[PDB]
Design a protein around this ligand. Sequence first.
Ligand SMILES: Nc1ncnc2c1ncn2[C@@H]1O[C@H](CSCC[C@H](N)C(=O)O)[C@@H](O)[C@H]1O
Ligand SMILES: Nc1ncnc2c1ncn2[C@@H]1O[C@H](CSCC[C@H](N)C(=O)O)[C@@H](O)[C@H]1O
Lengths: 238, 229
Amino acid sequence: SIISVSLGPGDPGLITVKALSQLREADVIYYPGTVSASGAVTSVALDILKEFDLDPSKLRGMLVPMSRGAAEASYAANYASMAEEVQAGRRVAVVSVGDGGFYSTASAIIERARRDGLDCSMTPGIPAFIAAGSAAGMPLALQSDSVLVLAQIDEIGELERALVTHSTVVVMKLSTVRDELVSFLERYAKPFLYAEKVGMAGEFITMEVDALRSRAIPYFSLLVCSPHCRQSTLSPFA
Amino acid sequence: GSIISVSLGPGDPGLITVKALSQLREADVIYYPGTVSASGAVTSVALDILKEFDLDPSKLRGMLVPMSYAANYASMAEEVQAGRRVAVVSVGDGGFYSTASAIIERARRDGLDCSMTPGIPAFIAAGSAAGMPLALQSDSVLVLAQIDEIGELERALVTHSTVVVMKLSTVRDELVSFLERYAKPFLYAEKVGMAGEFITMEVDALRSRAIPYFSLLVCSPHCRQSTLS
Ligand SMILES: Nc1ncnc2c1ncn2[C@@H]1O[C@H](CSCC[C@H](N)C(=O)O)[C@@H](O)[C@H]1O
Ligand SMILES: Nc1ncnc2c1ncn2[C@@H]1O[C@H](CSCC[C@H](N)C(=O)O)[C@@H](O)[C@H]1O
């Protein structure tokens, strides 16, 4: 069978009991990764998997890099071998950072596993934006709030318009408006959370625009704009 | 001592995080939410989850509300000052329409050591249970809760393609009327991962159906990518 196993967003302790047992029992793994102009691999998913004491030879990397991302194609070029351990009776999981049905490319493997037969399942995980809220010690939503989550916005204008109609707004992937961010956070003169590599080795979370002026805004970062940011341990309002 | 907002996840005990489980097992005292109706019957899905982890039963403290209780802060203040590890639990995630949020704010409002361990929201568990994605490359996701009238949802659905609706009890009588006129893919998800889970993408399955507090609605084109469409 093939199982879409959510890892949670970075802290290995944030994997579910179920997802962890599913990893320990899989015959082969399948994790996404990135190469950044020369080779040498970066994989936030493998960084998590490394803490579970899994057999290193079960893990199958899925690589070509950050772009579109071309991720859709990359997974597709690996499902062929996924419908082969499966026909040979083996347990295949395909891991996702955060949750496997929340902006995950794993959603191509499962949509294709169904229609093709083959016993497939999704085990859910904690979205990054959820873990970010908790890392900052704030609520994301209270009583009747709406929450809007956006991804891959094409220019900062989009965030600005959404921000008068909605309670909380969450913006993911953020190396897309990485150059517009500080100017945006200056206008909008309102509380925000910037959260990078939540639960991972290089975690960085801030509510200070000053702290972002010279910061490189990488793929694994998100923004929360919400009056609830005033409740964070990171806010002067306490 | 200290106080921790521990998220339980949304119902299936296997969906608690390893960390949250560790923290419950180490807690001296665990406070959990529940409701008591006009008749005196108690409902507590948090305790239903808790009863799946082999915790010492004597350490569990109910905080029962009609259906104000943010007042339970003594005994918690009481316990922490005393040196004890207090846990306050939430179904799903504790910062996502959770009333643990009230306790934590009050807790830090005093000197107290507080932290939040996240959990999986029920809308997330629902998409996974149905075998469908909630979001792909560039989609927006809109979550509404306790909408004041059904118009809210219609208005949202024209300008947003994936809309989740949560405390649906405010709008329960209007649901089937709405779905026949929407005439598009949807997921109804009730008590996901709990005894009596019921998941449907069929309007006929909702006609004789009583729609309770722990249900949510996902309206998304992506519901067609499920097994149950
Ligand atoms: N640990 C983390 N910290 C900050 N952002 C993260 C993150 N993990 C994932 N993200 C966000 O997720 C985007 C990739 S889309 C994948 C989302 C993941 N499936 C989830 O459930 O959250 C990144 O651009 C970033 O905005
Ligand atoms: N197991 C479950 N199944 C279906 N709906 C659930 C659920 N748990 C919570 N809900 C939804 O959550 C609403 C309560 S507000 C609590 C939300 C919880 N903190 C979370 O993170 O999901 C309910 O009205 C219902 O819409």
